[model samples]
Target: TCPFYKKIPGTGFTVDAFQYGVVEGCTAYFLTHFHSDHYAGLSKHFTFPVYCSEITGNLLKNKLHVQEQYIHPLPLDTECIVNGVKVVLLDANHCPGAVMILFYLPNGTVILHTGDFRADPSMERSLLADQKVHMLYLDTTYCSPEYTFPSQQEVIRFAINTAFEAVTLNPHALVVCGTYSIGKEKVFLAIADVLGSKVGMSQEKYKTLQCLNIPEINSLITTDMCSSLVHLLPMMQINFKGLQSHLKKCGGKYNQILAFRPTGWTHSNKFTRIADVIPQTKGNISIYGIPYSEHSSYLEMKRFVQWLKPQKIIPTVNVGTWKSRSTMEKYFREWKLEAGY
Candidate 1:
């Protein structure tokens, strides 16, 4: 018998805490991040006020396009008191609008929620909410060593190298990869900025790039300022080394004629995976493996947990996510606790 159970795709609702999880008359709920897991069960929001970072606020209402009557917005590093609960926001170093949260209840208890955060050494590393923190919430996505990834700079370098090598072989080809329409827009803009010109890019991509505001990060990426590069030769698509033979036939007219293909992570990883998947396209298909990524890897996740060494770390997302429970348990155990085992 095909068991009869209700489940939501992309929304992992298993036989876990969701069994009878319902908070009645709970006055407030602060979303730690915009990820579906963190914000699912949002229909309950109609009855309770929901607070979020301003950046997440816009993305929630505008990008994800979720509009609710009880939505509340707060600026990063600012504190707000709603009805008596103290709420604070801090940088999560994961995404543009992503946030780590702090809550002070009337009972004088403190709770810290860490959303999907990238581990940073140069940045402050304080895992515990506060020495007096009673509870901690963590994002247990990449809890395994095997799941860990390299640092941000290293991945960016990989993207540059791979794209450069790809373009060197295919002179007449134009390249573009999938990127977060919002987060990856920065990468696109960054390329345009550093190149001191707007290389060939589409109007949608161009307008999307303008949404980002970073001088240094964007400066290194170069694009065709004239926007004429769109029609070059073969079309540019996702990165998967499938177009080598096609580019080889372009003769010498286009080889080494193009700059590295525009690539980025965050929004890019979803579609940029190659070296593993078979080449779906025939004819001319070549792509450089971009190591760029958005979410933190295992090592980074470990470092992040080490920083916010909370009294108790509770990871809410469930079994289906790539996050391994065993790995997360080990770290949570370091703090002398286990989360949803």
Candidate 2:
């Protein structure tokens, strides 16, 4: 009866959280990641035990201030039986500790919920090894043909090159990389490593990154904004208006600010050949949206479904957008994808 969470027919297992899912007598809960949208309706007072990675658990306890007793850390790729269901967590490749859940229900149905993942050569091998996924719950963020972009690696390199070019063009200008509250640390870390500079961050992000205990990254991140040449500003603060205001305020110290965003929705046209270039600019502040999405593209999804050949397809996010129910039907006609779940 819930929207986000998939409540198996006549079962107590619930995936993710929402206002309606909690009241349906959720016996066991599985958390995919710590993103606010995925962890909606969760709080410190949560009583049910949540199964997630150690890093994700730490974020919940330290960042969100959730109780420790309710958090359960499970190693990636390990199988755990919860209330007679076999569950395995695979690296989702989205954020620090995101996971794609594979659950074997007691009713003899095997389902796969890809929380948020970008399909690559490695992930293709990992998920396609076992072709027994009866039901597939897809991440449909960019489920249209207009969103063709390069992979995360290519996008990161573009961002790094763009930042260095901006700095080279004007040494006095400040370079800012926009990212979510979490995720995309790789983009900034590479920038710092390549440029021989430290990336500045907010206090909250700094604490969370420190808790991650990643040796190479922890030392590259900093709280002091002045000493660092590249700054890791939150996604909300990198907008055109936002950048304008910030630049206007800091005009005395720095007149030019180059900002770049890595996203799948970079170009508006139908389809442009993938290349390394900043496609759009607004006023003095330039913003570039590369294809650094956590979700797979239209081609990737089609290829994924064609290979796996799941019995049923379930759209997770953007469930209503583009009439997913009908759009998916037209999209996956080439495969053995069923009409309804």
Candidate 3:
């Protein structure tokens, strides 16, 4: 049931496959989130009409500099007709602008595409509560049972308390938060608020946050490195070697560093002890690999598939090869059988 090149079967719509370059039957383009992998093929010169949430539309305009006329900022939970197909946007709970798209085709097929989402209870209420989904394009980032982890709230609270405690003991310890372009804002923002410390990020990152229109962001962030002990750096810059270089640039402002490498990869059911989730120290530097993720966990994915019970399921990620795709499909089959479908 997987269509060629990420296109919806029997439609001129393609979701998050811009690199394929003007698909033969494509008339409209859809983006689920602002993540680089999803928006890779999009550029300023591209002319296809792009549909996304209001926040993502602004990011496209400001961050990517796409033409204003080509971007369509759709409202959430409202039905709109796009080339004779009914489309609705539902919150993805993944990022600020991320959304799960619902498409009701003219041929009476109902499709749901979850674009890199963290499944939550609210989704059941908001997404097609009264309608049946014929096809589901799921974000299969963590399709294996071994990938089970804690909820976002649990992880966020743990990270906040850990950072607060670390900073309270050593006032001069710099809290370096690993972040991407848009996601994981909640973790670092909460840490800064709890510590009553300003965040230092690059001007480009500051501009990106400004696009989110967060009210308190202006007061919480600064470009001056020495002014804030909590610094937001790209995920790649959180390594020991990178931090060593960073501390050298900071001169003597900070005595030590407590870096947070927030990602889903850090935690798994395979770990026996809870302490395994705790921070690791090497000399004056500490690294905390928190279970902070935007993608849904294995349990969450199972719950979602059981709840929706779509006629067919498509794996969006980990579909690179037949073996990988079949592995995910096996999980889906097992889930469906357990659900008594």
Candidate 4:
């Protein structure tokens, strides 16, 4: 009832088998990116055809690599029509597998669901003007007053700084972090750029990278390397289990392990568990909870609401205090949702 600013970040209802039957009328399915919520409850609701970017499918394969399977992959941005529904994929600046979906109905109503986006001005100049987009199922994830997102570059820098600090301070202590298989791969690369070596990750992330079709990576590690990472740039990336055991068993005996995964906002319990695990690692694990999120911040959400200037806006997904911020409060807010700014 409040606004987007009130909700906790990095969470929303994904796929819930309990609500399976609600999607019976959905003739087509769109997977904007491999992020869990976007594709979570889909396996049951969408059985006919599930579409995404070409890279998205590869990522899906990787998702399944960690047993994250939920749907069959379809190529991205390609035109596909089913019965009377038409879908197209566009670029989303959030993550590598990210894509924007547009649904065109026969009755002439066009709904553009920009899953999650960053207003990259340079990228904006090159958007395709092929067809007019009607209603926008916008990335209101951050469409409110308090949220704001750091640019991808800023995110990269923050991650690098965090990892370097861990390595420099703890030196020889094993560092471990977590991330989804494909949805957040840039964090791996960003850490690599800083550590000059790959960070350790789960089997799922390894498979996700396989589908990206990057040849340089293939040369470095291929085939069954899903077990653990040996290095990033020039540093070692070990499996979470391996590092934990090694740290505990050989604590202060040997130190060369550094593990990290670039991640953003998540539920409090999840965050607490991760933070707590740090001390349990017996001086082996040094965990840093970085506020790296893909969603827009309070500021970004309001700006987006303003940009679209929708005649009527209804929020489908909301959380925390942002959920408390209601439309009635917008009486003084401008059409772009920015007037109050």
Candidate 5:
């Protein structure tokens, strides 16, 4: 049985649970983003009517091959009535098409569900500030104080500078970046722009990027493996063994390899500056674990919670274990108490 919170109390509407299979009384399906974790069970044969942002809809149709009629793309910052319930979409700031869904029920209850987000200043100026949110389904990916990291721009800049320096020392070095199916596009795009190099990626990934509608990235993408020194590959293939095999398979197209593993898990509060984070180097291969996170930090989550002042909050991540859930709840309680709400 699906959790009650996953759906709107008594309504059959479900959010981000295509894997749960129909869910007994599921009326409509809602997808937050195109990330595999969120859209895990969704497939081409899926027959349910799904609601998501326009960009997410494109990915679903292009990537997942889901039929166009089944996808209902709702525009951002606009309200629409779905099954007699008012619904709105707000930019999530996590990825290109990710959104924070807002539901205005007939009973005058406002529910805000943040799929996955990086809290930013623009949210405070949106209609979110005026609405009295009843329940908030928060993205608690970095709910602990120890997970603080630098801003995305700062990290991207660091990655660019680091890659530039490595290439300057060894011009024949192959620059490889680990990325997910959708996120981390900016990191590699910026690096390619700065290095005056094209990006080598799989044809499938190139098609997905084309759906994003980033015109500037067109000149940087190349399907030919040997044409570009910079390559973007799946994150799972970023380890030492993987990189070594990849380098060998390249047929000595380049002398050395400089790889970047951009993820939030690399960040810790002990690091005073982004530059202080070191890279793991071997004979001819170097791996840099940059803290380029798309999720909100503890302080950012606290600020969002306090500002929204929702009557209740339900964490959407890191909740499978009791200790993690309790820790997040403790922080929520403290924030609520401190806000005098």
Candidate 6:
């Protein structure tokens, strides 16, 4: 219920249609980001004008082939009027073009959709400056105290350095990385930018990257598999079979292979870290799952809730345990009774 796809009482608009199957009732649309869960159910049949970042619109056009007239760009950190309400788009710091949407309603109520984001303090400073939020559609992906992780920058550095060191140790080895087709472009982008080499990507992924149009990311369709130092393979490729198949075509066997998985699951505080560079290894492949995430950690979420101090906390996801105000009050002191309206 908290996804907030329902039409606003008097605003004449609906937001984030990936959850809702059809776009029949909504007069206006907002695409928070291009992640599958947030971007699901959209198709060429969609005729409504969808609002999102410039990059997201490009992806929509290039990937989904959505009609150009139906896509409108939502610039970051700027205020624009939509239908009558004042709306502002701020950086969500999740994926490339993810943004937090702030809507100033005609009734003077301010609602913020923290579309999939990592709560960066710099962004918080800008977001918490002047506005008083009445409702917050939070990205509670890792909303439990048990989830904690290092910064995305640190983890990216960790991944890059680990791959370099792995290659250094085994001179003839092949390196592979696991990433989402769209969301984790930064990881491979960092590797390419720093290392001064090209990355081999699948045809479809390469097309998505071209639509993104990052000048620094030197990625090309697979011409020669072994020509590149590292392979930016999908996270689902799994184990070392994908690596073996590619090397098999070249009729050469590398001594070893290293793979990096940047994710939040490792930071759940339920696992053990045996070594710094090498966490878990299977046969010839050494893999490390870094505590890298796009969503806010539990502490970060608590701090944000305290900073915003909204009267009501509406979680975007289905949390049966924390559905009511009384149940939610148990998580943070900020969720206490407002005393008066």
Best by lDDT: 5
Highest TM-score: give the candidate number. Answer: 5
Relative to the true structure, candidate 1 reaches a TM of 0.63
CA deviation > 4 Å runs, candidate 2: 248-253, 267-269, 274-276, 279-284, 337-341
Ranked by lDDT, top first: 5, 3, 2, 6, 4, 1
Give each model's clash number.
25, 0, 0, 43, 0, 0
Model 1 error, position 93 (Å): 1.2
Report the C-alpha lDDT of model 5 over 202-241, residue by residue, as the tens digit.
9988899888867777788989878888998899999888
Q: Report how far residue 29 has shifted in candidate 6, in Å.
A: 1.2
lDDT of 4 at 339: 58
Pairs of colliding residues, candidate 6:
none
Candidate 2 lDDT over 312-340, as tens digits, reads: 77888766655766776677664553423
RMSD (Å) per prediction: 8.5, 3.1, 2.0, 8.1, 1.5, 3.2
Model 4 CA deviation exceeding 4 Å by range: 1-19, 41-47, 59-86, 126-132, 161-175, 219-246, 249-253, 256-285, 319-341
For model 4, state the Cα shift of residue 250 in Å: 6.8
Q: Per-model C-alpha lDDT, please?
A: 0.49, 0.74, 0.85, 0.50, 0.87, 0.71
> Candidate 3: where are CA atoms >4 Å away?
1-5, 267-269, 272-276
lDDT of 6 by residue, 60-137 (tens): 998988889999997778889987788999988887788888889888898887878788667657855787888777
Clashing pairs in 3: none
Off by over 4 Å in 1: 1-23, 35-48, 64-71, 122-131, 164-171, 184-187, 193-283, 318-327, 334-341
Give the alpha carbon lDDT tens digit for every residue of 173-193 in model 4. Answer: 343455543445566556655
lDDT minimum window of 10 residues, candidate 3: 267-276
The better candidate by lDDT, 2 or 6, is: 2
Ten residues in sequence with the least summed lDDT for candidate 1: 1-10
Q: Which 10 consecutive residues of model 4 have the lowest summed lDDT? A: 7-16
